[PDB]
């Protein structure tokens, strides 16, 4: 499948943080939580590519795959999956785009591209 | 990982049976899911070991690799993973019992084990 090289890892959480939590509240936990495998949370805003708070709760990452091993234990984590592109024309593994710890908008062309 | 041999998968769907739908709308979804890559739907009964209502939503059924893969393409599912043991000691997958397409009740021990 193209864009699963093994180096993309989704990972789904069950109430990331907690019941009712905001949208904001769960991009935090979805932070905290890789950065106890990454070593801190600057770090794991680095690997973090998207962000997902409908359909599913959990978060698209950067990591190795000794890493992702790594999360399957922690408190909160559901499911580890290795991540493939929902667009591969434009490398765009789905969900909400997150950079740097910001959320960013797709042109409205490329969130058709993306829409199931 | 104990049990996770490639022949047990778990296949979450987005929203089976609907938005609010019941536990029985959700376990028809399953069914009927698992049944157009199974060939029917009285298979579909035999193969699935479990099934998820709450915390996720999908079920455990007993598939090939190549079955599992075409799973994907279907409307509704979300997730293809390969199963493994919650309770290792009695081959238990976890998630709610499901036999001959009716839930199973666990012994109260045997669900403080999962």
């Given at each position: ?49 998207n ?9 698209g ?22 991540d493939?592109?929902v ?5 765009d593994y789905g ?22």
């Open positions: 499948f193209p864009g699963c090289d093994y180096e993309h890892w989704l990972i789904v959480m069950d109430k990331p943080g907690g019941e009712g939590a905001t949208k904001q509240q769960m991009i935090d936990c979805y932070i905290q939580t890789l950065a106890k495998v990454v070593g801190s949370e600057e770090e794991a805003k680095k690997r973090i590519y962000v997902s708070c409908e359909r599913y709760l959990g978060f990452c950067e990591i190795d795959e000794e890493t992702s091993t790594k999360l399957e234990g922690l408190p909160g984590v559901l499911f580890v999956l290795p493939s592109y667009d591969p024309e434009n490398k969900a909400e785009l997150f950079v740097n710890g910001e959320i960013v908008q797709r042109s409205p062309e490329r969130q058709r591209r993306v829409e199931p």
